[PDB]
Amino acid sequence: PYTVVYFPVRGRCAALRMLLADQGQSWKEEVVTVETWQEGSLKASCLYGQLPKFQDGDLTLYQSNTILRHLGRTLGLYGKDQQEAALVDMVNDGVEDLRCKYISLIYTNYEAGKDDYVKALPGQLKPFETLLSQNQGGKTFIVGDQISFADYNLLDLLLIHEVLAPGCLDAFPLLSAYVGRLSARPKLKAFLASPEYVNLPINGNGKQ
Amino acid sequence: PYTVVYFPVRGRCAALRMLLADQGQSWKEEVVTVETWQEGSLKASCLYGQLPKFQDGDLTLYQSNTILRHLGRTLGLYGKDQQEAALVDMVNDGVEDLRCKYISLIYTNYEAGKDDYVKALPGQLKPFETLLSQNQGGKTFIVGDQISFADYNLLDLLLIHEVLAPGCLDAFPLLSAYVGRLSARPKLKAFLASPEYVNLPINGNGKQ
DSSP: OEEEEEOSSOGGGHHHHHHHHHTTOOEEEEEOOHHHHHTSHHHHHSTTSOSOEEEETTEEEESHHHHHHHHHHHHTOSOSSHHHHHHHHHHHHHHHHHHHHHHHHHHTOHHHHHHHHHHHHHHHHHHHHHHHHTSGGGTSOSSTTSOOHHHHHHHHHHHHHHHHSTTTTTTOHHHHHHHHHHHTSHHHHHHHHSHHHHTSOSSSSSOO | OEEEEEOSSOGGGHHHHHHHHHTTOOEEEEEOOHHHHHTSHHHHHSTTSOSOEEEETTEEEESHHHHHHHHHHHHTOSOSSHHHHHHHHHHHHHHHHHHHHHHHHHHTOHHHHHHHHHHHHHHHHHHHHHHHHTTGGGTSOSSTTSOOHHHHHHHHHHHHHHHHSTTTTTTOHHHHHHHHHHHTSHHHHHHHHSHHHHTSOSSSSSOO
16 A cells, blocks of 8 residues: 655645545555654665655655655546646646745745745745636636646645745635635545644744 | 747756657747846746746646656656656656756855765765666666656756766766767757757856
8 A cells, every 4th residue: 555654744745645635545654753864774775865755565756746746647636638737747846846945944044034935925826826717717626627636735835835924825815715625625624634634743843 | 839938048948858859859949038038028927937938739838847747748758657657757856856956056156065066966866876777777768668758857967967077977887878878869969969959058157
């Protein structure tokens, strides 16, 4: 089945877990403690010396976006055709770009950079609002009319930014409604409310 | 057909162009000059305010990796099955991670950071040598026995690092042979030797 190996944080595993939960999939969580990591053996066995590590049967995967695409491909959350698949990738790459900036802020200079970051935020979120506006008025998903792995990734990005800059989605009605709508999906709603998700810190350094 | 809209540099378009050339595809190049960009209109029309922009018929794509995956998907350069497709993604994500570090070095602090970067390089390249060693002895491609979009992206990454740190592939026999072997593919060899490629700077700030 599935096994996700990661630190005890939401971080880069938040989206794929939301995906797994919402899709009614069962998975095992192998928590890696900072002590176990600093020991060296696991790190060395990891392709790029990092987590998340994912196992699907004897297929071992590394890289959060690789796991998302893999699950999207095998579970049918990758568009209805090649054109949609490309748009899904375009959205995910955009999400990843902002996530990189967010991770940098959180870990390198949260203190001095938070203000400029939050100021620049609207311009960073605008593209997703625009995408929504061009797809059935933003009433369905980020691409097409079926959920895709990019939806889960974008949802997580929006959720963590609401914690970082409360009200950042107020100026974006489509994104706002989008978060509410997806967060309401039964299995996902249950998962988001569960201790498994709620009792995990967003990041590893206590900042958010 | 295909149209690539980008600045007059190899940068993030190098790999997809190598891919197009080697696959015998025809494409149009729309060069964007720094003057045209600073004018504002094009930037504003770009989803994430950036290039490359790619057109395949009326499908407009942004994000270099989205274009690579799209071409991989439509041209059959994405593995023979889902398992290989996942490994292809894992390699491309790894390539993109190192490319991000390279781009950072080149544009933010080439001066003070070059030494530490080149020192850390072997550890960054090792994973790809390892992948090669586990796939038919590294005699074919990065994943499976057919070329994939990740091959072109990895090849470009290796080529630009040879310019940044001459001899960085000396310690990696599989990667070395890999570059030589792929660079020898007829159409690719011709493309790499052509003015279209050779007369373009690797980066936009004259550093490499």
